[PDB]
Amino acid sequence: EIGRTTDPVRMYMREMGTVELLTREGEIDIAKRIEDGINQVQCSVAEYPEAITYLLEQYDRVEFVDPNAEELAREKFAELRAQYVVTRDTIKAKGRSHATAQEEILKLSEVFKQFRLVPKQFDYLVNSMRVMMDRVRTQERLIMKLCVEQCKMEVHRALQKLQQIEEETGLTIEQVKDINRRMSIGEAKARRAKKEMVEANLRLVISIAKKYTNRGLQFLDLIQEGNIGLMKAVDKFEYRRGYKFSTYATWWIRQAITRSIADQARTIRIPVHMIETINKLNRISRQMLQEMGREPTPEELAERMLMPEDKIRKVLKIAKEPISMETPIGDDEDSHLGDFIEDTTLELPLDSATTESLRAATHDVLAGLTAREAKVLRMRFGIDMNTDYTLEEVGKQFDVTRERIRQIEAKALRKLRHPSRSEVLRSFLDD
Amino acid sequence: EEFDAIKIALASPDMIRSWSFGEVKKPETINYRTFKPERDGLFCARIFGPVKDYECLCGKYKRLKHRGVICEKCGVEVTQTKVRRERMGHIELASPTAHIWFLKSLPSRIGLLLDMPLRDIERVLYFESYVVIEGGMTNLERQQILTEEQYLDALEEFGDEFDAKMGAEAIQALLKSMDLEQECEQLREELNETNSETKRKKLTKRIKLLEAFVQSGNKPEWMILTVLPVLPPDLRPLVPLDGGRFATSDLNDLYRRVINRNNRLKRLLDLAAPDIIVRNEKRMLQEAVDALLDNGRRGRAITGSNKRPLKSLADMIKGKQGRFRQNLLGKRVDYSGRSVITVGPYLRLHQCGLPKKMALELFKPFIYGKLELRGLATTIKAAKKMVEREEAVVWDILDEVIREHPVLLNRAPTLHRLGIQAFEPVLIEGKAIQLHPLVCAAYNADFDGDQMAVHVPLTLEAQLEARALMMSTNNILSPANGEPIIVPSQDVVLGLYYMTRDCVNAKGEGMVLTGPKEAERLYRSGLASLHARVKVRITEYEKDANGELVAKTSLKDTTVGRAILWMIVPKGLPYSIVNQALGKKAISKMLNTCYRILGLKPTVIFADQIMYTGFAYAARSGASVGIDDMVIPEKKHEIISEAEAEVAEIQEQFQSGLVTAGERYNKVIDIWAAANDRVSKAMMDNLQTETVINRDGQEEKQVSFNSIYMMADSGARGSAAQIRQLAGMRGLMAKPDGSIIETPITANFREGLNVLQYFISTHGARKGLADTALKTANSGYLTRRLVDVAQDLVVTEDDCGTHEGIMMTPVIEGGDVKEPLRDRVLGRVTAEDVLKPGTADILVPRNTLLHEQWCDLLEENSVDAVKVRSVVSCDTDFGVCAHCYGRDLARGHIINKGEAIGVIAAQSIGEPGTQLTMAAESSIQVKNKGSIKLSNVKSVVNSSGKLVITSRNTELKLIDEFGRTKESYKVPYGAVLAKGDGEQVAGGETVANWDPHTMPVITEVSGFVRFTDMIDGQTITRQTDELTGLSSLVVLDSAERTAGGKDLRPALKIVDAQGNDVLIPGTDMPAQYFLPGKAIVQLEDGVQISSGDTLARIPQEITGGLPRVADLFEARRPKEPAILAEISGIVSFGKETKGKRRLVITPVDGSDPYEEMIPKWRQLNVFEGERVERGDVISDGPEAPHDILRLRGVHAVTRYIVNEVQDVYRLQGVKINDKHIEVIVRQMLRKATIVNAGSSDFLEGEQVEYSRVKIANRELEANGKVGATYSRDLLGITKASLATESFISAASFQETTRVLTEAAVAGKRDELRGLKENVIVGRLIPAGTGYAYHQDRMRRRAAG
Ligand SMILES: [Mg+2]
Ligand SMILES: [Zn+2]
């Protein structure tokens, strides 16, 4: 049925129309499932002990306040450290994965979950698992390939590397694989859960956006930026608070849309704070105009904004936006503003010829002067040579005396001030 | 720096990175307080170069010690500023994006490679459906569209072998995987089995694309973008306007949004978003790129802030206001000025008056230079101050500078090459340019507010070619036709007319004078009149056999005025030139004679002196215009009243019902036309020769000295129609569109119109005025197309050595001779001499230029047909030889090697375009006495002894005593004649007679008639009439024929009493007269028909303007084309199918039968098997040039186009030599198509240049091998100009995007041969003065 509606807006609305809204029950349902996935991944992370070691060591290295447990940090972590250390010994006690050691690990995770962790450390912990997982998988894909293709159940030669991998890792591969795949499953559940709310609330994004569409960036840019905001809001929402989802989401959507419309949408990028001030200026001007019945003078406007006159004037001049080079200035649409603008960088052929003549004349006048005087003047002002050498360099080159160079220059100036020699240079009088 | 050619090709991503100096990552332009550029924004100094010369932002690495060294801390290199004009950047797209030009620009190259319909690529790109890249498992294949749910259905089952993708990644993966060689060979094989014409041609074009695409070295992957380049900042500036505002180009905006969408896509992918959101972003990125590359082609154009669409790159190239036409082919210029023009009559033909102020400004630097030379100013600044204060020495220096320095004067529009001419300046005061009166005609200038532009040539070569090629004294003949352009006009003609004319007895009859000097001394003393008839002693000179001037003295009868005029005439001309009352034609002929006898310099001086004398004596005449000078016939009101009363009686007679509407209308119009003619003739009789003078006695009658009549006769300004309007009646008028109003306008401008008559005339006034206003544009467009087609023509060789030509005869349309030979052959080279040993002993030597003398010889020997070498047959490659061209009409000799023919031809044809606008057929009657000679006539004698013709093409002529043709006519089929061949007919006699609204089948013999295969009710209808009871038989056609009587073909058996038909002697044909459908025989079956009687009666019952010539040159196909006979042999009908008329031609000797479908309602001229030859006309209607070329050959189409173009111009009295139209036709037959397997790399159906085929063919035939066979194609102006071997010429002409796309894909190479090419690239053109230069470079190809 598609009538080749090339309009991207139509394609977007057609795609988004399929997913149907559901309220007051789903939001709770999906939020519960998200929290369940996160709890699963946290539990399985706590299961892996070397991650706990690494995190505790990293905490010790670096050294943040008010932890949500249903020198404060150090004294609260002292007993957790003692518990973890005494749990290591029990793991060494007669069972690698003994039920008692597992119960101690469970209680350690239960205590640990009661604390709050910065998300970046959580990601660091996940990558600390990913790196070793990839290393072990990479070093062993070749051995699995060979055993599958050649052996079909060398062997002892390949077994050395496998044993070395175990020695380096120092833990059972099977539990590592379990924790890694459990990471994958928990994360997959969480991700696939959040997609549902995101695809549900696109209409909300549409409404909030169209409230701002009046000639800004473009409709679709606003919509996409709002979708970024919606993803953020879905991340931050908690049903435990007991509120409706829309109430929370709308703030993040407005923030994202407005921040983008501030950053983009101008050729010369006014910062955010100035945009806020200009918006205040405009909101005040409308009201004040309808009150007085005319336009407000900048002085009265300054009185109302409680700001100095010069600040207001500066904002008024900053506000304006550039004009297109193709605006038709002629009444007939033949001539455009662009043809009307002049190039400033170029010099004039007249001045080029003048400069060349000046150089020639100066060379002629200098050639008539005493040889050492001429070379001294050239050496001092950088005439004809790439750079000018200072007084000290000239002194150490020709004659160490500093004041002698001063006297040389004085005599050269005296000579060239003699009216006979200067006659032509006077023609360069006005410049 | 120096180069040789320009090549175009696609850009690989690594190439685009190669151009780059860094990549642009943020959309920022500049900082809002300190306007310096931003770090990685669109204007960064690090990647595009430093803003201010030799100064980085920090300035630590300065003083030209570090050259090319990058200052690390600010990242700003220390070099010149100009680099911001040439450094480029790049942007690395997050998702591959299709290039719009190679997707939508039809025929959609991406579609051709993959063989997918466009809408499928569309649906894939916009994420609407999947596509299968690789089905290893047999279920699916490549390029199969998969719907959304269908992909789920196939994945869930099969999986893990199923590659399907969606969006531009999918298309790029498809292109990357496809192997060209395989399809090249497979399609090569596929054409070898079956050729469905449509399928065959589409396969040929796709194979062409693949083969070229392999050759060029491009890879299809590159049609889809991954890296996108960014144009240098200074070509899209952001500049501060004086008011504090900023002005920006639109590319800034488009680039910003591409960067924004790209950055946000990277952000989205980094963030692991749902799929609908990333699909949305991917579409918007693709759309932004499309809007950047070409706005609005994707349907909806992105509008700027204001209301209007942003203008993109393709917009910067394409239009009339793109780069190509507005900044490269023609550009604004220094050293130039402009002002109003005014007449200066004291000037010599090579001078122009230049204001002092304009001259002071134009020649500024020259003045500075010579002020410094003489020591008057020490330095240039002193020279400035000297000039701005205008000291006297400045004026002396200026007078010394301009001397001998020519300037160029131009008046737009420049229609032809005489619109720019070089003059020598004379300084004047005032502010208007003074122009010599004689050059106004060439410029088409009048002094009522016009303006002209002045340009200054600078170098020595420019000055010399202004003096030699362009000076006004070098241009006296027109290049279109040979006639002079310096032609005296209004006041000059009036003065010379008044001075020359003679009068009765007025002062000084019959004195005798010792030469002209006494005549002047008498006239200026008041002792005699300019008009006295006097006897004067005169000495002429006459050029001898070897150029000597013999002097001859005599006593002539002349007037005082003519004697005085004779003092001007250069010696060498006869006295008879001056001895009659000179008009306009006489003066122009006088100048032409002086030119072709004496040379150039005498004519220049003579033209001046004519102008001076004409002005002087026109002023002394004191001719004026009063209102009494428009006399009105004494009997106008009588004519008007008689016509009114007669029309009143015809209208009264109408109400008796004797007269219908059409009768009354036509009668009234005829009456008023007759009255108008009577009034006009009476007015001219009263006006023209109305002066009665006493000749020393009784009365005498002479032509009048009425001033308006003088302006009429002299040809100064008036005409007969204008005077008719002033003194007769204004005439009849036309309603807005076609209809001619019934009552005419009886008043004239002296009497004054009334309200209603004025309102009536306004219609025609406005219609004509709007016509001109809206006709100029069409003229301009036509001439532009013509100039672009034929620009490459230049005279290259001296003699191609060809033996071809065109036979030429005088045009004898209708009764009277439209054009003799001397106008039509003068100045052309005869090839394959025509000799006539016998009556005339005609000797024409080979290869001679036809001078006037040779033409005179031809006239006195009275020859009619001459074969002449012509451009269309020239054998030179990439040009034409001098000999095949002929004279250079403007100069007067064989044309020089290296001159640009094509532009001259196009200009000469297109220039007159502006002035170009927008039934007694019973028998044949000879006008003048002569002898009849028929040609191609099939005659049959009847019992009446009258010659009946059955030949389809019968032509009637009139040979005179000396053996020329004076008339020609087309005898229709079945027309009875009067006299046979050979006898002399008499003037006014009728020679043929036929039925106009009927084509009769005429009988040859007598006997009994049998009505065969024609039954009543099935084939004919019973027709019953009244008491007389005369019946008629009418044959019904198969359209209404019943199903039972379908196989019955009507025919008339001609039997005798025994039934046996006597056979025609020697010929074995059976007498089976199968007359086709609707053979209406009124006489019933069994009626004796005499020989020569009618058997059946089947009845047989033009733009002409600027569009007509535009259609002739564009080779458009007439809607109802006449059909031509392809192959000689036997003709018949065949089995009808759905009514498809079936025409079968089986050749008499050839075996292959040729079938033609024929439209149902079209009639057929021929009945059955005849002897029809190649291109024998069989239907009636306009003829198509394509068919002419295919069947008759190239000379036929040239002759056709020449004749039917020249009709349009002759009807307006516009003279153009045929040579130019021949040139255009040559350029219009450029291509050929190959039907053979030769020995070279060609194919079925390829179109290649005729010259290329000639080269390959002669190369192989030098080695024995047989070349391919070709047939020339005829293409319109626009097609032929768009199909050249050079993408720069075509791209500058028209349709830029399409030709650039084709060239880019095919990897073309431009070799810079034409004139437009070298003009664009800023070089010397290969014509005229520059020619020699290129030929040197040509021999440099020998040493490389
Ligand atoms: Mg005018
Ligand atoms: Zn620096």
Ligand SMILES: [Zn+2]
């Ligand atoms: Zn030739």
